[PDB]
Structures are given as C-alpha cells and as structure tokens.
C-alpha cells in the first residue's frame, strides 16, 4: 500500500533513467520495424551487394583509420558488432548507476556486476531491435536480414542465430520499455556473480527490484498469467545464451587470426 | 591491467 506506492515510484524512476540512458527504445524500434514512423526508412542489407552499397553510409566513422580496409565481410561485420557492444556497455553502465543503491556498493562489486551482467542485458535489449527476419542496426539507420547473417562463413554465420531464437520467444511476451527497465535492473543486481565481496546489500536491492517487477507485470499485463515466473526463466535462459556465446568466441580465438578485440570487451571476457 | 569498467563507473555526467 505505502510499500506498493513506493514500488511504482521506483518503477517510474527506472523507466525515466532507462529513457535517459538508451537512445533507441523498444517503442522507437518497433515503430521502425512495423513501418509506423515518419522518419527515414532503414537501409536493408540482405546480400553482399546491398552490404557494399550501404556500409559506408551507416558504419561508424572511426573504427579504422581510413574506413576502407581489406578485411573480409564476416570480420568487418564482427568489428561492427564489437563497436555496438562497446557503446551498449557504456549505456548499460550509465543506467546501472541510476539504480538506487548501486553507486554506494563496493566499487569492485559494481565492476563484477557489470562484467557478468552486461551481455545478458545486451541480448535482452537486442530483442527489442529484432523480428524473426532481421535486426535494426546503426541506431535504426540499417536493417540486416537474419538470412544474410546466417549466410556468413561457417564460424561467423552462427553467432546471431541463437539471439534471434531467443528474441522471437522473448518478444512474444510483449514487454514494453517500462517492464524492461525493471527486468534489466533485476539482472544487474544478481548476488550470485563470481567474486562478489558483499552479497547481502546486492540481494537486498534485488529483492526490492523483484517486488517492483512483480507489481509492474500484474498492473501492466493483468491478463498475462505467470508472466513474472516466465521472466525469471528468461533470466536463466540468458545465462545459457551467454555461456554459448563465450564458447563460440573461444573458437574464434583459436581458428581465426588477426582478430582485434576491443579492450573493453577484453576486460569483460577475461575469465 | 587497469579496469576500464571502473573508469566508466567513476565518471560523472
Ligand atoms: C554492416 C555494418 C554497417 C558494418 C560495420 C563495420 C564495418 O567495417 C562494415 C560494416 C555494421 C555491422 C554490424 C553492426 O552491429 C552495425 C553495423
Ligand atoms: C576494429 C576494432 C575491433 C574496434 C572495434 C570497435 C571499436 O569501437 C573500435 C575498434 C579494434 C581495433 C584495434 C584494436 O586494438 C582493438 C579493436
């Protein structure tokens, strides 16, 4: 009652912070995907010719010295994925710092929570930019088809497919940005990450976030039976996605060569 | 060795 009102205020705080931290929300992405926006339509990359035609227009200007390079397509795309992941880590870090209690945690525990939580959040939020046929890229300026990503040479063609599989099922839950803001906060505040020094304050924050999430889902999805339990299971599923992803990367580190990995991702993947 | 995540966490607006 008094507790419930504070849980709504927390939910709203998190939503407002999510809006401040993440430029491309699910609402804005869905409008683009469905075609209900007045903005310019994304450039569709569905084959090698359209990749060539669109890549200079939508890629980041300062990934390489000259922007033109001799690396094969699959690696160029992988480098673009890294740049996007690095930006996402920075957005997620800013959001985490808005979660009440987070910045007062031991700083090494803040690091651990981000290190072991950011990829679960990346894949959650990637679903907002996906449908069964492709993914929005470059802040919504491009759309790369799932089939084209699958067509990439053996190692790289398998990177995104598990994320599309997750996204199609996750998107069937019809969460909105308000729901997602709390879900992501719950994931960040996971007290079972390896090497946490003081678990109790993290669990106490998470317990309150979980209560806020349950109330959010009951009010915002009154006809969606067991949605809270479903989201708890998606948290488990995301850990398995990340485990599988790390494995794919280890293969890359063995079979592939001349593989630059951004230092921020090197830190996250270490051990 | 130094933590890039720690640097991000410590920067204010
Ligand atoms: C296709 C894309 C514009 C790109 C990025 C970098 C690159 O060198 C060539 C092409 C790209 C790939 C992956 C991505 O996440 C965003 C953008
Ligand atoms: C091209 C590369 C993968 C990259 C990816 C993303 C990025 O923002 C900047 C650079 C890169 C180049 C050189 C390097 O030492 C690490 C990473």
Author numbering:
A (entry chain A): 205 to 475
B (entry chain B): 140 to 152
Q: What do the study authors state?
A:
To characterize the binding mode of BPA, the PPARγ LBD was co-crystallized with BPA and PGC-1α co-activator peptide, which contains the motif LXXLL, important for the interaction with the protein. PGC-1α binds near helix H12 and keeps the structure in the active conformation. Residual difference electron density indicated the presence of two BPA molecules bound to the LBP. One BPA molecule (BPA1) binds in the Ω sub-pocket of PPARγ. Hydrophobic interaction of BPA in the Ω sub-pocket with I262 and K263 stabilizes the loop conformation in addition to crystal packing interactions of H266 and P269. BPA in the Ω pocket forms a hydrogen bond with K263 of the Ω loop and with two water molecules. The second BPA molecule (BPA2) binds at a crystal contact. It binds near helices H3 and H12, interacting with Q286 and F287 of helix H3. Binding of BPA was observed at two sites: (1) in the Ω pocket and (2) outside the LBP. The latter binding mode is supported by direct crystal contacts, and MD simulations indicated a low stability of BPA bound at this site in the absence of crystal contacts. The magnitude of the calculated total MM/GBSA energy is −20.2 ± 3.9 kcal/mol, significantly smaller in magnitude than that of the other binding modes. These findings indicate that the BPA2 binding mode is not physiologically relevant.
PPARγ, an intensively studied nuclear receptor (NR), is intricately involved in many essential pathways, including adipocyte differentiation and the regulation of glucose and lipid metabolism. The signaling activity of PPARγ can be fine-tuned by ligands, both endogenous and synthetic, which interact with the ligand binding domain (LBD) of PPARγ. It consists of 13 α-helices and a four-stranded β-sheet. H3, H7 and H10 form a large cavity for ligand binding.
